[PDB]
Amino acid sequence: ADKRCYRMCQRYHQRRQRRQCKKGCRYG
């Protein structure tokens, strides 16, 4: 589960970075 990464990306000041952070932090 990548719930941790998600939460970390949620607290992103920049949206472009927030979304990219989550979508980028996939399971692979």
Tokens at 25, concatenated: 């932090």
Among 7, 2, 4, 6, CA closest to 22? 6
Instruction: Kindly compute the dihedral angle of the four CA atoms of residues 17, 14, 19, 2, in this order, to the nearest 10 degrees.
Output: 80
Two structure tokens written together for 4: 């941790």
Domain encompassing residue 22: 1-28
The separation between CA 16 and the C-alpha centre of its own chain, rounded to angstroms, equals: 10
User: 10 is written with which tokens?
Assistant: 């949620």
What total of structural domains would you count in the chain? 1
Task: Please report the beta strands in the chain, taking only residues with DSSP state E, as ranges in sequence order.
Answer: none
CB atoms within 10 A of CB 26: 8
User: Which tokens hold the place of 23?
Assistant: 């979508």
DSSP state of 10: H
